[PDB]
Amino acid sequence: LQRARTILEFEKMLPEWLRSRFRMGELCKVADEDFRLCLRINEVKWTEWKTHVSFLNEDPGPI
Amino acid sequence: AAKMGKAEILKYILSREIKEKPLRSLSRKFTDWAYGPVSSSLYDLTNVDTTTDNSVLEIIVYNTNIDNRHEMLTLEPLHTLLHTKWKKFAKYMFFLSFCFYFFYNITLTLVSYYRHKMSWLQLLGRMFVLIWATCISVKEGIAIFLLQSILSDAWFHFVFFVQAVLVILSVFLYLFAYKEYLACLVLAMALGWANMLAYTRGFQSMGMYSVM
Amino acid sequence: KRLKKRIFAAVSEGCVEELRELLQDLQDLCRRRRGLDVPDFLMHKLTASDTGKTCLMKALLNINPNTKEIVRILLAFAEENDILDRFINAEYTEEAYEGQTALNIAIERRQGDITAVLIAAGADVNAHAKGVFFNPKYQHEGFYFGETPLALAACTNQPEIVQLLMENEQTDITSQDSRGNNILHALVTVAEDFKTQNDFVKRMYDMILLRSGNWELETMRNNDGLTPLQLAAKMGKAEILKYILSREIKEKPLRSLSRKFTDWAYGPVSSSLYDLTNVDTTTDNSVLEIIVYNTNIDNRHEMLTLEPLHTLLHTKWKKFAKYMFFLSFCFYFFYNITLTLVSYYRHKMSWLQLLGRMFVLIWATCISVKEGIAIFLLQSILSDAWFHFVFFVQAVLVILSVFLYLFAYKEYLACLVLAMALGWANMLAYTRGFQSMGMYSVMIQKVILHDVLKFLFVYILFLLGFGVALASLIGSFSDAVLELFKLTIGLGDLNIQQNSTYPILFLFLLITYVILTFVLLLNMLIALMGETVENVSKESERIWRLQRARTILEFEKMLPEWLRSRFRMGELCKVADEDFRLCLRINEVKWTEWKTHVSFLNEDPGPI
Amino acid sequence: IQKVILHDVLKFLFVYILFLLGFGVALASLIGSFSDAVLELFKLTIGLGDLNIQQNSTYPILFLFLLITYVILTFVLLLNMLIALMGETVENVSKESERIWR
Numbered sequence: 001l002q003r004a005r006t007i008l009e010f011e012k013m014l015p016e017w018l019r020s021r022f023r024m025g026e027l028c029k030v031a032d033e034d035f036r037l038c039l040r041i042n043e044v045k046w047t048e049w050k051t052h053v054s055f056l057n058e059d060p061g062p063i
Numbered sequence: 064a065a066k067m068g069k070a071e072i073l074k075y076i077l078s079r080e081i082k083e084k085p086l087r088s089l090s091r092k093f094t095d096w097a098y099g100p101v102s103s104s105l106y107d108l109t110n111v112d113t114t115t116d117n118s119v120l121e122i123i124v125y126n127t128n129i130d131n132r133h134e135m136l137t138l139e140p141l142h143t144l145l146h147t148k149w150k151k152f153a154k155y156m157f158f159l160s161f162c163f164y165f166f167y168n169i170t171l172t173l174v175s176y177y178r179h180k181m182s183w184l185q186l187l188g189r190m191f192v193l194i195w196a197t198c199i200s201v202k203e204g205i206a207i208f209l210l211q212s213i214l215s216d217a218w219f220h221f222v223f224f225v226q227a228v229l230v231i232l233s234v235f236l237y238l239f240a241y242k243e244y245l246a247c248l249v250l251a252m253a254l255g256w257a258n259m260l261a262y263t264r265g266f267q268s269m270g271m272y273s274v275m
Numbered sequence: 276k277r278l279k280k281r282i283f284a285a286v287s288e289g290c291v292e293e294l295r296e297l298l299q300d301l302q303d304l305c306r307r308r309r310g311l312d313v314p315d316f317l318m319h320k321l322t323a324s325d326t327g328k329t330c331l332m333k334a335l336l337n338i339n340p341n342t343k344e345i346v347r348i349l350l351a352f353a354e355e356n357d358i359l360d361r362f363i364n365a366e367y368t369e370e371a372y373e374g375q376t377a378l379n380i381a382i383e384r385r386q387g388d389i390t391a392v393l394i395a396a397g398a399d400v401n402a403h404a405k406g407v408f409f410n411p412k413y414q415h416e417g418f419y420f421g422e423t424p425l426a427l428a429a430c431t432n433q434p435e436i437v438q439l440l441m442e443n444e445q446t447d448i449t450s451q452d453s454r455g456n457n458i459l460h461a462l463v464t465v466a467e468d469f470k471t472q473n474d475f476v477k478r479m480y481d482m483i484l485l486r487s488g489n490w491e492l493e494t495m496r497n498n499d500g501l502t503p504l505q506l507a508a509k510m511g512k513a514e515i516l517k518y519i520l521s522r523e524i525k526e527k528p529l530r531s532l533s534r535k536f537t538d539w540a541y542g543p544v545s546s547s548l549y550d551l552t553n554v555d556t557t558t559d560n561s562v563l564e565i566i567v568y569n570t571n572i573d574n575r576h577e578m579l580t581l582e583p584l585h586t587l588l589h590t591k592w593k594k595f596a597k598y599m600f601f602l603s604f605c606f607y608f609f610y611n612i613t614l615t616l617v618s619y620y621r622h623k624m625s626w627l628q629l630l631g632r633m634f635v636l637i638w639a640t641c642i643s644v645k646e647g648i649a650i651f652l653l654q655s656i657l658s659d660a661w662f663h664f665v666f667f668v669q670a671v672l673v674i675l676s677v678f679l680y681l682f683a684y685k686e687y688l689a690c691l692v693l694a695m696a697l698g699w700a701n702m703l704a705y706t707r708g709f710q711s712m713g714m715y716s717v718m719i720q721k722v723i724l725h726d727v728l729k730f731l732f733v734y735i736l737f738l739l740g741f742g743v744a745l746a747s748l749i750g751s752f753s754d755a756v757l758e759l760f761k762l763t764i765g766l767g768d769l770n771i772q773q774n775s776t777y778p779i780l781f782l783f784l785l786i787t788y789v790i791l792t793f794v795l796l797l798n799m800l801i802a803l804m805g806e807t808v809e810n811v812s813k814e815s816e817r818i819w820r821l822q823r824a825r826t827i828l829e830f831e832k833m834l835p836e837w838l839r840s841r842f843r844m845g846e847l848c849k850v851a852d853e854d855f856r857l858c859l860r861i862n863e864v865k866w867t868e869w870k871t872h873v874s875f876l877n878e879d880p881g882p883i
Numbered sequence: 884i885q886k887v888i889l890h891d892v893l894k895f896l897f898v899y900i901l902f903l904l905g906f907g908v909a910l911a912s913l914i915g916s917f918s919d920a921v922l923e924l925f926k927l928t929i930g931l932g933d934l935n936i937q938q939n940s941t942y943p944i945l946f947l948f949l950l951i952t953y954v955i956l957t958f959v960l961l962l963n964m965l966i967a968l969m970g971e972t973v974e975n976v977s978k979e980s981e982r983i984w985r
């Protein structure tokens with residue numbers, strides 16, 4: 001918790017145009033006429049086996 | 064859900080994947096691509112990031128009255144977003160903070176009793192002390208004025224301001240020509256080494272040397 | 276161009292009747308385009324130009340409950356135009372995804388029903404996927420299933436689809452992809468422990484192996500040079516390596532493809548012959564030299580409790596190195612005793628002094644030769660690669676000393692002392708054998724040195740922190756700061772207690788230093804009783820088994836060749852028709868598993 | 884129990900004698916010269932600080948650096964013995980010394 005305060009306090013110490021450069025996440029079209037700043041987290045699941053019907057990008061490549 | 068500390072109802076907001084086709088928009092944790100057992104999942108940061116006035120970070124982290132803050136900070140669009148901010152901001156800045164404050168207290172004891180046209184390394188060393196201690200009184204003077212709390216980190220904003228003001232109050236006594244130019248400057252340097260112990264909040268090996 | 280994109284759109288959804296009339300339009304497009312004879316025109320209207328994705332791919336990507344109807348119309352449309360070979364066996368042309376071959380899409384989507392339709396129509400079941408995705412450089416970028424549709428069926432846990440591909444004719448089970456792997460490498464490459472994977476990789480290793488029936492597809496080497504046993508050791512896959520060394524197969528027509536033969540069983544007492552065909556240091560690689568001489572993996576203590584490994588360390592210990600390591604411990608101990616005697620204590624020299632100096636000169640040169648090889652042959656320096664260095668340092672400094680006597684320098688005396696002082700440091704490095712000396716390893720002593728230096732890093736600050744306040748009450752600091760830590764040693768000072776300025780304040784400052792140091796000293800013992808106790812007692816017992824296991828293998832390379840011919844573990848046994856394998860005997864007693872015994876080599880149970 | 888403790892102290896002495904001999908050869912170079920210096924070494928742990936051998940003719944700053952590393956490393960080994968007794972001896976003997984007493 002004491003580290004987590006020092007991360008937020010330092011971000012207010014940055015200038016405004018530094019936070020524009022250092023930006024976490026990318027814009028992604030998740031629905032029709034929608035764009036959201038989104039974080040990518042890659043996970044590997046071996047137990048839950050199912051066919052995949054809810055997926056945005058058909059071609060799986062990190063491009 | 065962040066301010067009251069409700070944990071498992073906040074897991075449901077940041078991981079609300081909805082696979083139904085007519086309303087997939089009302090969802091977070093989108094799946095970008097899945098191939099067999101390897102799947103790439105886009106969590107959402109519409110209000111879960113310090114880019115607006117409030118955020119889920121500033122309400123979870125900058126908060127003392129609740130409870131339970133370590134459990135909410137292991138939720139997945141939060142716990143990754145601390146770690147990505149740590150890897151690109153503050154593993155550089157906190158180590159840069161640790162050196163400039165360490166070279167500050169080294170310079171205090173050297174120019175005090177050990178060592179116009181002064182010596183060139185002695186003049187630039189005294190130049191480094193005068194500007195930097197005033198920056199701490201300005202910086203920590205704001206953080207006290209903006210803000211139970213003193214158990215966690217609100218006391219630690221005070222003591223750097225105390226170390227800053229006593230150096231400034233010392234040289235002001237030289238303008239008023241008092242005897243306490245010597246004694247109060249010593250108490251500032253002795254309290255200065257106390258706050259280098261307050262940079263032990265980052266180091267995991269120094270977790271057992273906290274104040275708690 | 277509107278007609279093309281409406282086909283890819285109608286295929287993406289369940290629009291059956293829209294897809295029919297588009298094909299009725301596209302067939303009417305071919306009647307006006309009879310001049311090109313439509314090989315490529317039928318491809319160009321059903322395949323994107325840049326990516327090479329086909330309409331048959333596009334249905335299998337987007338699984339909907341009308342997918343079974345979309346494909347059977349497309350395959351019937353491909354059959355009317357006689358283009359079914361190019362329409363099914365088509366592939367991407369991107370930099371990634373090279374040859375994804377829509378059969379592999381249906382196998383990925385866990386759709387076994389539409390899988391059989393493609394195979395019966397002819398889907399070229401050995402269609403190698405390539406490209407940078409399926410052969411990823413980083414682990415999270417892609418998925419390495421093994422570049423074979425037969426591999427992906429068993430790697431993604433589809434047992435009935437393993438059956439459909441294998442029983443097909445031109446499956447070619449022993450195929451090698453890029454990187455050279457079999458299917459058995461691909462199952463070994465992709466596995467974890469029993470957590471996260473409920474044993475499917477182990478049984479998918481099984482089901483492919485019985486239908487193979489031969490010793491190719493498990494004695495085949497990839498481009499690196501490894502068999503699926505050796506590659507199971509190098510990557511550290513634990514429970515798939517339990518299955519190789521304990522693969523007993525009780526079926527009569529193929530009992531040869533087995534390890535852990537049962538030699539004789541009588542009631543609850545059974546004698547089991549494990550196998551050592553490549554599990555013993557008699558070839559270039561082995562499962563011992565790949566498990567023991569390896570630092571990059573993880574997990575080495577778990578693989579070394581597997582049964583043809585764990586016994587084979589113990590049998591080598593009982594007949595080689597409980598003799599040699601105790602012989603190593605005495606010759607190095609008599610070495611450092613002889614150094615300090617001939618240095619300062621004690622032509623025609625004295626006879627016991629001349630033979631003592633004779634023992635030092637030849638032996639220290641042997642260490643520089645022996646450890647000079649082990650450095651030249653070879654992250655690593657955390658475990659035993661640093662310990663090969665220091666004996667060479669102790670060897671060379673004695674040799675460099677006497678060379679300075681040839682160059683007549685003053686440093687014949689001083690460098691020889693530093694060699695002797697470093698010589699007693701390496702007798703502490705013979706504490707890797709003794710189990711009582713497991714808590715005196717370097718891994719624990721590094722953690723303790725980490726926890727003391729950070730305590731000094733607290734203590735120096737409070738030494739400087741209180742000490743500036745001592746310097747004000749009267750170098751004045753350099754006199755007072757020496758009085759401060761000597762007070763903790765026990766030097767109480769009376770004259771500086773009687774200060775001119777504020778004697779009651781300096782006495783109050785002294786008593787708070789004694790208390791706060793006593794707080795910090797108690798704060799160090801909480802750090803060691805809290806953290807160090809549990810985890811290192813797990814770690815120092817696992818690093819002690821491993822450090823012994825390196826000393827057993829290093830000693831075996833120190834034996835001559837004809838000594839390893841004499842000292843031989845295991846015997847030759849006829850386990851099948853016209854087969855002989857060097858095999859270890861392990862006698863075990865099982866009382867719970869009751870069964871009649873039908874798989875046994877020797878009918879008469881006697882140890883003869 | 885008293886056999887196990889005597890086993891764990893003698894192996895600590897078997898570490899300590901080596902570091903007594905190991906640092907002590909470096910003490911013998913900075914100036915029997917060893918037999919005078921090796922007596923000063925363990926009496927320093929008893930509490931006999933010596934002033935004249937602190938003022939060496941050859942390299943006084945090196946011998947002071949050698950002295951402070953002996954005090955720390957012995958304090959490491961002394962802490963290393965208490966980890967051995969709190970880690971192993973506590974659980975098993977409390978199972979064993981109650982069964983051997985009955």
Ligand SMILES: COc1ccc2ccc(=O)oc2c1CC=C(C)C
Nearest residue numbers: 001003004136137142145146147149
């Ligand atoms: C170093 O990044 C941080 C920093 C602070 C915290 C605080 C709360 C927490 O539970 O997690 C955190 C992480 C994530 C660490 C890793 C290794 C993903």
Ligand SMILES: COc1ccc2ccc(=O)oc2c1CC=C(C)C
Nearest residue numbers: 156159160163195198199202203223
């Ligand atoms: C990166 O700079 C730092 C680093 C750490 C601290 C610590 C406390 C504080 O109040 O101030 C700090 C500053 C700002 C100083 C300047 C000169 C802008």
Ligand SMILES: COc1ccc2ccc(=O)oc2c1CC=C(C)C
Nearest residue numbers: 579580585588589592820821823824
């Ligand atoms: C003394 O033989 C050794 C030597 C080293 C190891 C290292 C790993 C391991 O787990 O087991 C080992 C054994 C077997 C001991 C017995 C009593 C069967």
Ligand SMILES: COc1ccc2ccc(=O)oc2c1CC=C(C)C
Nearest residue numbers: 599602603606638641642645646666
């Ligand atoms: C059995 O002999 C030993 C024993 C232990 C060691 C230890 C390290 C080493 O590098 O060398 C050794 C030798 C070889 C010495 C000779 C004279 C052939």
